[PDB]
Structures are given as structure tokens and as C-alpha cells.
């Protein structure tokens, strides 16, 4: 019993974190095979950060200008290239700790674990959702640039995120491991602000199922609804439209509890309009939207990894 | 910036979990050097779960009654002894991934990370706190017995909890790594029930300071209170009483923000009286009590680690 927000065990990734230094700036890198991956704004200075010329600044850099430390050991750089917003440093040694991995790009609403690091050292791990405005609400202090987010499938690590910057509202923005930003952001010291966010409706439903699985059920009612009636209510409360697809991923939970998806939907729409009656669900006084359906299944059936 | 419920990286503990089987019972064990630790109820059968005589049960076991597997590999048990409610199995191989570690016993309000495991394999990692009724509100399924709680300050792993059982209310009870239960609980399937759970006041106050550090200000007021008057009010909301030691502990955060501890107590008292008015603090719509003053400092100022 019980239900916590839960991250993937981080061991496979802590073996990959290194420290990267270019002049006065030091940040984190991801050492896989013989390549170290890190944000390309490491080559920047404070002077040319309002308008970087990243191709221009790169070639002028020597392979020995980049200093890569893995713990007490130094890594010689024998080459570099830039892929979108990610720098790649070729080193002469393969990482003996490289796990099975693959680079994936995630969809808004999907969750992942973040390994926050500083000076190449893993500091903490936590669970984030890719918000619909393509930010994540993380916890990142100065020097956490280059920290990575990931999921684990069986024994394959899926790297989905690499941290680049903080937005003025305190939310965070980054790229996939191929250097493409999530959302309408750029890595320049310019003025940027996240779009308007929406509740990940399917995640709220999954969380309500997790509450029912755990015996927390005061919100269930006798009513049902349809996609059309629900969505008209959802827009006015700034909720993501519930598609036919969403219902089918909720299938397993709809089976294991005996509450149909449109049945659960009528409970959620009542909570939207009436409120929570000063009560809590799963020890929360707000509708939690950072648990995906797979997160609830993985946690309420005990999937383990390697 | 930002503030999240954060766990320690789990790699150092992942290298230590193994699967321990006795008869038809399988749970998790902790493999450090040449000892594997696990809950001693792994040696119970179904006839010995109301009033098990563990000394009697254990002397009847041979080393070959215990199957220990680290992944693909079988560990040969060469001895066994009992320390309070924890079994210790000596094996012929020290664990090559044993980290630097120690065993500590924690006090209520303290937080730690939990590496939940099944059949010796990690399923996930989350943060917990030891409540004042000496339970934790974990997330455990059947087969999670033997999972451990830990902190990693610097490079030393501090093991402070091993999971033994779930109580009829959904909460969990366990031991330190010396086999002593937290609280009045026993590893018997007899009727047991958690004492009243109080809100961990010093942690709430710490979280409110973390909010101010992060820029939240809407809940501040111009009142201050005495320590006695605050405890009279907070008691009525089932809050833990605040001692002078707690006031000292909040001193550093108090200095960093400029808000006196007793003046933040006045803010908490008002929040209990009016609730949140639909607003949030640090992303939450209730008052969080699972962050220590130490947790707040580590996350809000330099952590590195």
C-alpha cells in the first residue's frame, strides 16, 4: 500500500556523469562510449552570450581547450562537433560504465527522472513531467546545466532531456540528447517566457485511479459523461482535451478498479466545478497531474529494473 | 531555483541488494562486505506467524536452507546469526560494490530515501520521513520486505531503515540496521496499530522558510507569538509541539531570510486558521512536513555532493 512520487533508480546514469570545463565555465557532461555530451553554451562567455555565433566560437576552440574530468581522472579530447544545441566531445577512452541506452524525445505529459548534478557529481534524483508549455518544474541551482533526465525500460536507459537554463518564472527548459530544445526556447541571454500551461488531464485521471486502488474513494459518484461534454468543461478550466487515445491507455486501470473512464471523468468534472470539499486525495489537496498511467501501473504492480 | 521532493542517487545502494529465499519465502537482503542483512521473519512459515519463537526457528536452520542470489549468481551461505529482528548471513564472498557506509538510528521528523525492491531488484526510489508515531508512509507492495532507507551525505551511505511490515492503516514499520524496531511494533502478525500521527511542526516551518527563500511571500504577517501560545494553538491542529531545540535548529534559515522563528510561527498559526484560500505554497496546496531544516539548506544553497 501507499503511493509516492517515485524516480527510477539512478545507478546506471551516475556512472555516466562527468565534469566539463571551457575557460571559466564548468558544467556537467554525459559520458557514453567515447563521447561526452553537454550543452553547447559551455563555450560561451558573458560577453558573447547575448548573441552567440556558435559555429564561429566552436572552430576557434582547441581539443585541449576543453577540460573533461571524470572524478580524479582527466579525459583527453581528441575531437568536437556541435549537434543542434548539444556539444559532443570525442575522448580517447570508452566509458566502461556505459549502460544499454538510447536517445528518445518525449511527448508533453510524459514523465521522467532527473539526476541533478553539480561539478560532475550526482546530487539528487527527482521525478518531473514535461509540461504542455514544454517546461519542467524542476529544482536546479547554478551549475546544474548538463544534468540529464531519463526513463528505464527493462534494462535500457532512455535519455530524454538535458538541462540548459532557468526561465524567469523559475521553471526550466532544455533539449533532447540530439540538441533540439523542447518548446519555443533558444540558448541566448535574451528575454524568454514560457507559454500558458494546461493540466495534463489523462495524468489526473490516472492519479484518481491510483487513489481508488489505494482505498481513497470519496469522490466517486454514479454519473458518467462523454468526451464532448467533458472537454467543453475542460477548456474552461484550462485542461488538456481528453482524446479517444487517452481513454484507451487508461484501460488497464479502468479494468482493475471497476470504474469506467467516462465514469471517472464525471468524478473529475465534478471536482473541477464543485471543488475538493476541503478534503484530500492521496494526501494532496490539489489535483495532481504528474503521474502518467504507466507510472501508476508500474508502481501499483511492482515493476523492477535490471 | 525550484523546490522538489528529492531523493539521493541510488546507485551506491543498488549495488548491494540481493534476493534472499528461505523455504518458500523470498524477500530482499542487503549485501555489505561478507554479510547479507534481511528481516528475520524470512524464516517463518505459515504456522509460525502469530507468536514465532525466532531463536527456536533459527537454530533449526542450516546454511543450505538459505538461497541468496545476486543477479545471475548464487551466494554460498557459510554462517548465520540473529541480531534483534534482523538476520545476518555470512557468505564466502565480500561484495565488491560495498560503498563506504554506516548504520544510524534516526529520530522522528528525520527524512531518508527509500530504494523499493522486489526479488532483489530495484523498482524505484522515493523520499520518506519517520513520523512521530514511528511509522513511515512508504509505498510498498508484497515482496518489498528488506528494502532499505538511507541518506548519502558526502560519500558515506547512512542506512537507517529496513522495511519489515505494513500496518492495518496502510502505513509501514521497520527496524534500524541493528534490528531494533522503530516504535512499539514487533515482527509478529498479532494485532498492532499506529499511535496518533502528528504534523511535524519544525519541518513545516522549514518548508515555509524554503518558500520565502524561493520568493513566496503571500502567507507572511506582521504578528509574532510566544513559544507557549503557539504550542497551545498548534496542538489543537494535531501539530507536534515546538521545543526550544527546534527554535535553535531553525536559526540558520531564520538568519538567511530575516524572519524570526517566532514570527514565522505566527504565519503558520494564521494558515491553520484560514487555510490556503485556493493558493499554493511551493507548488503544494497543503502544508508539507517531510522536509527537514537540513533538507531545505541542502537544496536551496550549495549542494554539489
UniProtKB/Swiss-Prot annotation, chain B:
Activity control note: Inhibited by pyridone-containing alpha-ketoamides compounds 13a and 13b. In turn, alpha-ketoamide 13b (tert-butyl (1-((S)-1-(((S)-4-(benzylamino)-3,4-dioxo-1-((S)-2-oxopyrrolidin-3-yl)butan-2-yl)amino)-3-cyclopropyl-1-oxopropan-2-yl)-2-oxo-1,2-dihydropyridin-3-yl)carbamate) inhibits SARS-CoV-2 replication in human lung cells. Inhibited ex vivo by michael acceptor inhibitor N3. Inhibited ex vivo by compound 11a and 11b.
Glycyl lysine isopeptide (Lys-Gly) (interchain with G-Cter in ubiquitin), cross-linked positions: 5, 90
Residue intervals on the Cytoplasmic side: 1-305
Outcome reported for the amino acid change (mutating residue 49 to A): Does not affect ability to cleave and inactivate human TRMT1
Active site (UniProt): 41 (for 3cl-pro activity), 145 (for 3cl-pro activity)
Subcellular location(s) per record: Host cytoplasm; Host Golgi apparatus; Host nucleus
Annotated Peptidase C30 domain residues: 1-305
Superkingdom of origin: Viruses
Reaction catalyzed: TSAVLQ-|-SGFRK-NH2 and SGVTFQ-|-GKFKK the two peptides corresponding to the two self-cleavage sites of the SARS 3C-like proteinase are the two most reactive peptide substrates. The enzyme exhibits a strong preference for substrates containing Gln at P1 position and Leu at P2 position
Phenotype upon changing residue 189 to A: Does not affect ability to cleave and inactivate human TRMT1
SUBUNIT field: 3CL-PRO exists as monomer and homodimer. Only the homodimer shows catalytic activity. Interacts with host FBXO22; this interaction promotes the proteasomal degradation of nsp5.
Chain's role: Cleaves the C-terminus of replicase polyprotein at 11 sites. Recognizes substrates containing the core sequence [ILMVF]-Q-|-[SGACN]. Cleaves and inactivates human TRMT1, preventing tRNA guanine(26)-dimethylation of tRNAs. May cleave human NLRP1 in lung epithelial cells, thereby activating the NLRP1 inflammasome pathway. May cleave human GSDMD, triggering alternative GSDME-mediated epithelial cell death upon activation of the NLRP1 inflammasome, which may enhance the release interleukins 1B, 6, 16 and 18. Also able to bind an ADP-ribose-1''-phosphate (ADRP).
Designated name of the protein: 3C-like proteinase nsp5
Section covered of the full-length record: 3264 to 3568 of 4405
Amino acid at each position: 500500500s501507499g503511493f509516492r512520487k517515485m524516480a527510477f533508480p539512478s545507478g546506471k546514469v551516475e556512472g555516466c556523469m562527468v565534469q566539463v570545463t571551457c575557460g571559466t565555465t564548468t558544467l556537467n557532461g554525459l559520458w557514453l562510449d567515447d563521447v561526452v555530451y553537454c550543452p553547447r553554451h559551455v563555450i560561451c562567455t558573458s560577453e558573447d552570450m547575448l548573441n552567440p555565433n556558435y559555429e564561429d566560437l566552436l572552430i576557434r576552440k582547441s581539443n585541449h581547450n576543453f577540460l573533461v574530468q571524470a572524478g580524479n581522472v582527466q579525459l583527453r579530447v581528441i575531437g568536437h562537433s556541435m549537434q543542434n544545441c548539444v556539444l559532443k566531445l570525442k575522448v580517447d577512452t570508452a566509458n566502461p560504465k556505459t549502460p544499454k541506452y538510447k536517445f528518445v524525445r518525449i511527448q508533453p505529459g510524459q514523465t521522467f527522472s532527473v539526476l541533478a548534478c553539480y561539478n560532475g557529481s550526482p546530487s539528487g534524483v527527482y521525478q518531473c513531467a514535461m509540461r504542455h508549455n514544454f517546461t519542467i518544474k524542476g529544482s536546479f541551482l547554478n551549475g546544474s546545466c548538463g544534468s540529464v533526465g531519463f526513463n528505464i525500460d527493462y534494462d535500457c536507459v532512455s535519455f530524454c532531456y538535458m538541462h540548459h537554463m532557468e526561465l524567469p518564472t523559475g521553471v526550466h527548459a532544455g533539449t533532447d540528447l540530439e540538441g533540439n530544445f523542447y518548446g519555443p526556447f533558444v540558448d541566448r541571454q535574451t528575454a524568454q517566457a514560457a507559454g500558458t500551461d494546461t493540466t495534463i488531464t489523462v495524468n489526473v485521471l490516472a492519479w484518481l485511479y491510483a487513489a481508488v486502488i489505494n482505498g481513497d474513494r470519496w469522490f466517486l459518484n454514479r454519473f458518467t459523461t462523454t468526451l464532448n461534454d467533458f472537454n467543453l468543461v475542460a477548456m474552461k478550466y484550462n485542461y488538456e482535451p481528453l482524446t479517444q487515445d487517452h481513454v484507451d491507455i487508461l484501460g488497464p486501470l479502468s479494468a482493475q478498479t471497476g470504474i469506467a473512464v467516462l465514469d471517472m471523468c464525471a468524478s473529475l468534472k465534478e471536482l473541477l466545478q464543485n471543488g475538493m470539499n476541503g478534503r484530500t486525495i492521496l494526501g494532496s489537496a490539489l489535483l495532481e497531474d504528474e503521474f502518467t498511467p504507466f507510472d501508476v501501473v508500474r508502481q501499483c504492480s511492482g515493476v523492477t529494473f535490471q
